[PDB]
Amino acid sequence: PQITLWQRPIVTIKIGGQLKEALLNTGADDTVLEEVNLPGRWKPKLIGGIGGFVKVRQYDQVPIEICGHKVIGTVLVGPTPTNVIGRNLMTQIGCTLNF
Amino acid sequence: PQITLWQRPIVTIKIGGQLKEALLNTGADDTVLEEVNLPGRWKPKLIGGIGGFVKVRQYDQVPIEICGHKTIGTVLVGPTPTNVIGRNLMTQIGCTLNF
Numbered sequence A: 001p002q003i004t005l006w007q008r009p010i011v012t013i014k015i016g017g018q019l020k021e022a023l024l025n026t027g028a029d030d031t032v033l034e035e036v037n038l039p040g041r042w043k044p045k046l047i048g049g050i051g052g053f054v055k056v057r058q059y060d061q062v063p064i065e066i067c068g069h070k071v072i073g074t075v076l077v078g079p080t081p082t083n084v085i086g087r088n089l090m091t092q093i094g095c096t097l098n099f
Numbered sequence B: 001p002q003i004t005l006w007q008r009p010i011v012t013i014k015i016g017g018q019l020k021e022a023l024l025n026t027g028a029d030d031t032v033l034e035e036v037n038l039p040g041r042w043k044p045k046l047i048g049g050i051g052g053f054v055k056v057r058q059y060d061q062v063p064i065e066i067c068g069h070k071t072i073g074t075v076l077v078g079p080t081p082t083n084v085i086g087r088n089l090m091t092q093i094g095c096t097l098n099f
């Protein structure tokens, strides 16, 4: 799609058999989602860092659908004020900024 | 331009007679820039909010050039870990997310 930015670019993602809402966040390197139980191995990742890091679980090669774009990418699972689709997944969906 | 998101979408902005780097941040409602002296009236704005707000100065109708695109928009001036072009200015430059 073409998403204008008058509103927060919140998109529906499908991940871990759940439909979630997430913000297409070009300011985020990574994709951080709250409350998904992703299967399989993960490794700890420290994210944030300003005032301390937040430990999240990094799951790699996660199938995630973003606006009916099935991609695969790293999803960090842990506390996030809002579910964020970061650049890592936006590149997968071939999402670009255009002006 | 079409900006792919493999890297942080840092763009050069021209504001307050200065060339600055700023992140095209679709996750940011507002544009927050540090160390720009903007002329004229401003009103305080509280931004952030998680753990407390940061007070910044809201300058309205600021001429700002983003990747050569002259636009006018609200620029919040105050502490920001990175200069952020938020959606408010991305709409002005006609920046959209596309995939």
Ligand SMILES: Cc1cccc(C)c1OCC(=O)N[C@@H](Cc1ccccc1)[C@@H](O)C[C@H](Cc1ccccc1)NC(=O)[C@H](C(C)C)N1CCCNC1=O
Binding pocket: A025, A026, A027, A028, A029, A030, A031, A047, A048, A050, A080, A081, A082, A083, A084, A086, B025, B027, B028, B029, B030, B032, B047, B048, B049, B081, B082, B086
């Ligand atoms: C910067 C970074 C480094 C390593 C790894 C990752 C994933 C990184 O990126 C993630 C990140 O923190 N991104 C921020 C930028 C960053 C760079 C440097 C230090 C810290 C962060 C920023 O761009 C987007 C971020 C959206 C956000 C989403 C969920 C929780 C919190 C914030 N947007 C916002 O914070 C704004 C501000 C003004 C309040 N915002 C979010 C509330 C509602 N209003 C609003 O407009």
